[PDB]
Amino acid sequence: MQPFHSPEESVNSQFYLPPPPGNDDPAFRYDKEAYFKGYAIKGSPRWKQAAEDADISVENIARIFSPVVGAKISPKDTPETWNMLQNLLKVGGYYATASAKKYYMRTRPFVLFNHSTCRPEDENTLRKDGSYPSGHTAYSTLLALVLSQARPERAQELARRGWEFGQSRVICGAHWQSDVDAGRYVGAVEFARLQTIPAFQKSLAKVREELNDKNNLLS
């Protein structure tokens, strides 16, 4: 279970991403307004989804995307895919966002306004992690793209769910809208980098056949 590449092989997100919005910048005004719009729908359906989207454990990630990609994803039925899910979280959720995160150590909204998020358990961890850019977003975006490369006919569904997965971080109170916008781009950049790695290409080929197999088809 070795990541497709080492941390040093991720494209330096600190170099290509712009800096997060400043205190008096219109973009930050938007971040704050966006934060409160999410807070308003606390306890609604969309808000409960955001809470579920908060958990990136492979199990929950498989449960969420299985219907979207249209195939049952599981350790037994889809071995390579199962490893692909975890591997991508490592290079995309963490390695790809690392330099930028540490460089700015941006404070999270729920910390700023001293509020509770949609997933209280993860709060002590979040507090220690730089807000910009969002790892969940980078991972979901990357994931949507990889699965779309494996099952092209579910592209629109994957692209859509990938987008909402990111928005859940805004609604959940864990991230500023600007952290999510930057996370999507980080996920795309990582996705391109993976294309040049043999290990990734081998894994994709197997992932492709598992999710296209008639026995694993799901409605």
Next chain:
Amino acid sequence: MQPFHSPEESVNSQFYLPPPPGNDDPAFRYDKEAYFKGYAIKGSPRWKQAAEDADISVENIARIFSPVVGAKISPKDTPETWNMLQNLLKVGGYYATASAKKYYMRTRPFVLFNHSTCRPEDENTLRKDGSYPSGHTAYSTLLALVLSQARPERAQELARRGWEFGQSRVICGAHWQSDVDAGRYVGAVEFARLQTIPAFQKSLAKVREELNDKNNLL
């Protein structure tokens, strides 16, 4: 001179992109502020760079990206890359953005505020084209990713230039910031779709060979 895929073979942007920010939406107030922040620096160097970025002819894209990718890009030294640049404009700038564009027919900022853009020439065309999402943006994002795949040693430079190319559209007055943000997602999605098209893979192999050819480096 044959597009990688037909207009119908691109992922439907109207389905996966959210609708454009509305009049009282937080994102829209940000769009207006961003528009004026750019209109204010009209005539400055950054603004002049925006007019340069506004021109998507192949000759101008090559001039801008040769330094970034680190290789000469010409119809004579890199014919395949030359076609790749033009082909990506069709599938990524036009096909990939069409459905969302036509469905919302979002009014462009310069049209709404009665001002001129950083490149008057285009304004008559822009007038009748849906603002959301931005075609220049999807294109430069796509371009950046494809070139990064051909020469990963320049991934960061490419990813930064690609981003700025999209921001020129906002500074230029041609788009709202939200169109640009949407355009980047479209660029990535289309990038994913191209991977599964043989004509593309075959073309990328040649592009990689031309851009890494010692006789073509700067």
